[PDB]
Design a protein around this ligand. Structure first.
Ligand SMILES: Nc1ncnc2c1ncn2[C@@H]1O[C@H](COP(=O)(O)OP(=O)(O)OP(=O)(O)O)[C@@H](O)[C@H]1O
Ligand SMILES: [Mg+2]
Ligand SMILES: [Mg+2]
Length: 265
């Protein structure tokens, strides 16, 4: 809506991404606190990711859900593109997990409910996120989960690939194999997260790319003894090689382990 860098006072860095250098900022006239995600045009051009940036802006700017981070607008200058985002004051789920090591069943079930609700809203518009990982799950002022980083988002179904040499840990077999995929991709990532929240590490983690790939394609994971029967049941339903066999989000939200442990309403 006609914004420029001179309209803001920039503050401390909130985080770093591959391309996204994110800062706290304040709009000079209103004093409103927000985050500016800064991207270097030369790096976007070298990598050939301009189409992903267009989808990030066009998809995220139209979503309105309390568990989805708002994108208010954007602007650019000679060397950088600036995305104007809602500021998430309590940081990332990634950092919460590094601090706590693992989450209890109540916190896990509450975060899974919030995801589920955000994804149910996305999927109602045929939007699939495809990059649900803890560094992209931000926390609002009341500690509520907010899905962010819509760079890999697309309208379903899709055959487009995600990263090339980056983390495979949250991706399903159909995406790592380059096959056509849909909304069921986010259901698989939900199962990976549920496991990582309870155990402290994702289920297919390995020292190499090929071994992680092998474990994902064969769905090779085991549970430590402390994981309860209800959590094992939900995780096992979500991590099914066949996407058509993965549950609907309403079945996740009504699962007896979720309703028994989540904080509501
Ligand atoms: N609105 C925000 N409030 C607080 N922290 C944020 C916000 N946006 C991003 N961050 C932090 O900055 C880092 C970069 O976020 P983001 O995922 O948008 O960058 P990116 O991964 O490079 O994006 P993309 O995956 O589209 O290239 C994240 O680790 C996140 O913790
Ligand atoms: Mg990110
Ligand atoms: Mg991006």
């Amino acid at each position: 809506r006609q914004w420029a860098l001179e309209d803001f006072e920039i503050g401390r860095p909130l985080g770093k991404g591959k391309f996204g250098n994110v800062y706290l900022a304040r709009e000079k006239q209103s004093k409103f606190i927000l985050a500016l995600k800064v991207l270097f045009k030369a790096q976007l051009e070298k990598a050939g990711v301009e189409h992903q940036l267009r989808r990030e802006v066009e998809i995220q700017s139209h979503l309105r859900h309390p568990n989805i981070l708002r994108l208010y607008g954007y602007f650019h200058d000679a060397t950088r593109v600036y995305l104007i985002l809602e500021y998430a004051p309590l940081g990332t789920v990634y950092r919460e997990l590094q601090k706590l090591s693992k989450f209890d069943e109540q916190r896990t079930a509450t975060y899974i409910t919030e995801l589920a609700n955000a994804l149910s809203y996305c999927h109602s518009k045929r939007v699939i996120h495809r990059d649900i990982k803890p560094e992209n799950l931000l926390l609002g002022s009341a500690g509520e989960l907010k899905i962010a980083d819509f760079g890999w988002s697309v309208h379903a179904p899709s055959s487009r690939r995600t990263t090339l040499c980056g983390t495979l840990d949250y991706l399903p077999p159909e995406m790592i194999e380059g096959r056509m995929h849909d909304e069921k991709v986010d259901l698989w990532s939900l199962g990976v997260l549920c496991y990582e929240f309870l155990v402290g590490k994702p289920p297919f983690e390995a020292n190499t790319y090929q071994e992680t790939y092998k474990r994902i394609s064969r769905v090779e994971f085991t549970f430590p003894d402390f994981v309860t029967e209800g959590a094992r049941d939900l995780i096992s339903r979500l991590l099914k090689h066949n996407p058509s066999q993965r549950p609907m989000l309403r079945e996740v939200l009504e699962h007896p382990w979720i309703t028994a442990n989540s904080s509501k309403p």
